[PDB]
Write a protein that binds this DNA or RNA. Structure first.
Ligand SMILES: [Mg+2]
Ligand SMILES: [Mg+2]
Ligand SMILES: [Zn+2]
Ligand SMILES: [Zn+2]
Lengths: 589, 589
DNA sequence: TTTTTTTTT
């Protein structure tokens, strides 16, 4: 009685956006340029434009969605006749559905309607192909006829062959022809509920989702997604009777989003502040009093340096931080905060991790008994940050397994006839206690740290934390009580804004070293070697790795302000911060 | 529709190459003489000759390849009728398809089209036979009739059996006749995407390819290959239902490449320069400052000596290098460069390797329940170079498993009722750290190395690296910053040219030892042994292996300049580099 | 059972 085809077309071409620019017109034009085949529509925009259509989509999705897709194809076809013979149909995906249901609250009444689920991806299968319109040939000396079996109907998820030949009305043997068969991409993924939603005592539950067409390979394991689709029951062998009338639940995903223009201007406005570096540093772990030098160092690791890829070798651009401190110095507190503000981070512990789990594991699947590779903690953290708490408690024979990944950023496995190399370009932040629990001033620094010199040289910065009860006890006590009383600090950038700022900086900023910065870095490195050679007693070594640490830190400081060149000011800060690092380990420069 | 037989024949007989030598005419003559039954055609040559013909091959590949093959067969048969009765049919393989698609980005729209994928070979199955035209026999008291079941059609991939006997129009059961059955060679291989195209935080994907006819055994595992063919879906168990309407994809290989006259000309003129040895040495790891003695030693291992095979025993011709140094001395960077410039190299680490994974692994095939052998890292590196980083970090029980492979170049396995002996003719390059991380000058050499004398004697050269800060820090710092600034050293042979030069030398050069070099080597070996007895406390021993090392090094120097004999000059260089090895380890000369 | 990599008494 009522047709929404004109309404949908009117909404797409007449919708004044936030800036009154008809954003959906631009989105359509962007789709035509690269043949995206998929259009994303905000549910709120549909509700704002015409409410009546909004309930039709959310309640009658299985019928109205194909109608809208056909209307969209005609409009695009008129705009660009050449859109044919490369894309045969388009997809309309809806996001922002208010029907959000927890993974553990799914019941029978929720099956058959469009719902949204928030969770964590844990497993992705390789992309495969699914038949939705097959072609068969009747193997009978009379027929030799070709036909499509699922006539006037999309082929069901359960394969079925015809029993009577449509063109001859006879049974027999039918042969499938892959050449005339129509296929669609098919991928299976497993989603898991967030730890914040898991109830006390029980383990988290999992749900199976299916991605098809261009939705395949839209996310990687470990990501946080918001999948929207229709729930349905899953069957494997319906022909195989013998009870077992109980079925699982799987979701047919229609739209997926992971974790905008308005963010860019907000980010750009922040970088215009001359004191942006101080604001960022003061925004790291606002609940922790003091430790300004530690907060500044942790900010550098979040941004990192510029990796160099050459025709013969490649240079690591990540920054590694090591912290040694007495118990109660809150070392585990900023580590938790770092794992929260970083766009991608993995949190591990020295005791709860092994060498195989840190880098890669070779396991035998019982399905075939064939060995295959399993990604480790450092591999899954590629492009992000790996946090290793209580590193001193880790077994030494297991700790040496990360020496290659800390510098060469690769993992090499030669086990059971498997030879492979995996990228592990991740920043490593580690914390631990001294040899005797607390730091002892009488003993030398060498036996207090209790770490081999090989792993110490791989850390760009090393800070030693000492809990000395002094005058600042009253200041610290008042700060802690204020936190427990609900009092908070203002003019601190929020985590969500800070996380967006870091991600933008790591993607569009690549500082370059200037001549002025080169001279300052070169002079200071020479001063290190002369001082180190004078006293061959410190447990740390001034290797050429330290020179490259200066370069990486200088780039991080420039990247913190979204600068394109490493000026003298950034070089001075890089020199200054390492002076504190050398002072902590007892080297007086 | 215009016939392409005349154009194809005209193209073959009239195409002019770089020298207008009618290259494809020569290929046909080579094909006739050797009965190669296969022709390789470069796509760009076809496009230059006739663009319309090139387009037809790309798109109408299914129906035009047999047409061109038939025309070529008649031309060859006319050229030499003796070619018939020896070769039933020929194959036309097209190389140089502009359509290249990554392994991970294969979609449904690419099925049924000629595409090219470049990857790494992993697994190769033994050659088997496939039926493409069966011959059954309807046994029944009245029939006694035999027939070719697939009439006017090639036998499908699925083994199908006739239901009604064509000769009598009656049902029953049929018996296959192997004698009259036509067969074709069949092989299954697995290809993997290159590590440089795998997305961050994800494991590499795999694709299944099928090789038939002369394409079998065209490559070995670990090779980089470029395959062109048609993608198709894979059917495994279609007899039983149970849904599973999702299918994997495999590739029907049409042409395969691995990894010329012009290149040989370029190599020949390079050796004409009297300072070719210095140019090659200076081109090893251009991003590393200093370490000239290590650069020279690494170049020698790339070329190696001349293996000797006698009627009663064989002598290895590979050079083994061991490097011990303080952390940060760029030991790993040189090893990474070696693994990239060598024609065939395998990179492993001490911690990520096992005894089974390095030599050979015995694995039980779950399909049949019987044990079988899997090639280790050393076996896969036969005829190449094996790199073992962090040699001191592996357990001594596992490190001792390579004693036989490092000297006898064989691997002996007596496990699970399997007795075998596999060739492991590979050069071993190892690096490691001293016992206490950094070298201690006050302590002797015996406790610093912390390696058994047995494995030490198997290394041709051993170099000890010490990181002593001094007057060279400023020049070292300037060199590193220039690398980070994008500046590159000129007058350096590129990796691609250097790799070609090494491969040619290892294949066509076999130097001989003259009388002048014989006397020099004998005198030095006697003098070296005499000084060894003076100080028997050194962990290194002057075994007769060191005499063989001098011969191998002398041959490598001659092979570096493409010489035919080991002159007096090459003997001096071998002695000079040996003196540095002895001096570095603590033995004066 | 027997060979292998892995976490676990
Ligand atoms: Mg803690
Ligand atoms: Mg190293
Ligand atoms: Zn029929
Ligand atoms: Zn019959």
């Amino acid at each position: 009685q009522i047709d929404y085809r004109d309404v949908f077309i009117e909404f797409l071409t007449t919708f004044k956006g936030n800036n009154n620019q008809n954003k959906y017109i631009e989105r359509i034009n962007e789709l035509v340029a690269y043949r995206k085949k998929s259009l994303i529509i905000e549910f709120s925009d549909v509700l704002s434009f015409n409410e009546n259509l909004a309930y039709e989509i959310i309640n009658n999705t299985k019928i109205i969605l194909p109608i809208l897709e056909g209307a969209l194809y005609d409009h695009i076809l008129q705009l660009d006749p050449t859109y044919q013979r490369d894309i045969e149909k388009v997809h309309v995906r809806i996001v922002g559905i208010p029907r959000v249901i927890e993974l553990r609250k799914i019941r029978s009444t929720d099956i058959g309607k469009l719902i949204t689920i928030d969770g964590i991806l844990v497993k992705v299968t390789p992309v495969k192909e699914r038949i939705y319109k097959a072609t068969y040939k009747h193997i009978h000396p009379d027929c030799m006829q070709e036909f499509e079996w699922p006539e006037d109907e999309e082929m069901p998820e359960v394969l079925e062959m015809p029993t009577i030949c449509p063109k001859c009305g006879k049974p027999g043997q039918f042969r499938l022809i892959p050449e005339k068969t129509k296929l669609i991409d098919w991928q299976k993924a497993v989603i898991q509920e967030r730890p914040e939603e898991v109830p006390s005592g029980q383990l988290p539950r999992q749900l199976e989702i299916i991605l098809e067409d261009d939705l395949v390979d839209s996310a990687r394991p470990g990501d946080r997604v918001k999948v929207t689709g229709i729930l349905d029951i899953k069957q494997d062998s319906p022909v195989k009777r013998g009870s077992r009338a109980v079925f699982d639940i799987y979701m047919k995903v229609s739209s997926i989003e992971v974790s905008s223009e308005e963010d860019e201007k907000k980010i750009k406005d922040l970088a215009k502040d001359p004191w942006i570096r101080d604001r960022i540093i003061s925004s790291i772990a606002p609940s922790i009093y003091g430790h300004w030098e530690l907060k500044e160092a942790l900010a550098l690791a979040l941004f990192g340096g510029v990796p160099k890829v050459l025709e013969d070798t490649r240079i690591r651009g990540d920054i590694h931080i090591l912290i040694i401190g007495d118990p109660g110095t809150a070392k585990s507190q900023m580590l938790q905060f770092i794992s929260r503000v970083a766009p991608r981070a993995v949190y591990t512990t020295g005791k709860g991790s092994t060498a195989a789990g840190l880098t890669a594991a070779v396991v035998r699947e019982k399905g075939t008994g064939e060995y295959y590779l399993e990604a480790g903690a450092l591999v899954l953290a590629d492009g992000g940050i790996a946090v290793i708490d209580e590193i001193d408690k880790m077994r030494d024979e297991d700790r040496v397994a990360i020496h290659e990944a800390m510098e060469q950023q690769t993992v090499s496995i030669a086990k059971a006839g498997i030879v492979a190399k995996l990228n592990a370009r991740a920043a490593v932040i580690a914390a631990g206690n001294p040899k005797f629990g607390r730091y002892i001033s009488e003993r030398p620094v060498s036996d207090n740290i209790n770490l081999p010199p090989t792993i110490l040289s791989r850390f760009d910065l090393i800070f030693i934390l000492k809990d000395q009860p002094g005058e600042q006890d009253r200041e610290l006590a008042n700060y802690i009580l204020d936190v427990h009383s609900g009092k908070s600090t203002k003019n601190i950038i929020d985590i969500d804004t800070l996380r967006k700022y870091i991600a933008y900086a790591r993607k569009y900023v690549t500082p370059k070293i200037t001549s002025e910065a080169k001279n300052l870095i070169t002079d200071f490195f020479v001063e290190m070697r002369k001082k180190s050679s004078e006293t061959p007693d410190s447990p740390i070594l001034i290797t050429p790795r330290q020179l490259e640490a200066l370069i990486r830190i200088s780039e991080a400081y420039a990247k913190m302000a979204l600068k394109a060149e490493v000026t003298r000011e950034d070089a001075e800060r890089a020199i200054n911060i390492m002076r504190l690092f050398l002072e902590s380990v007892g080297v007086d420069m």
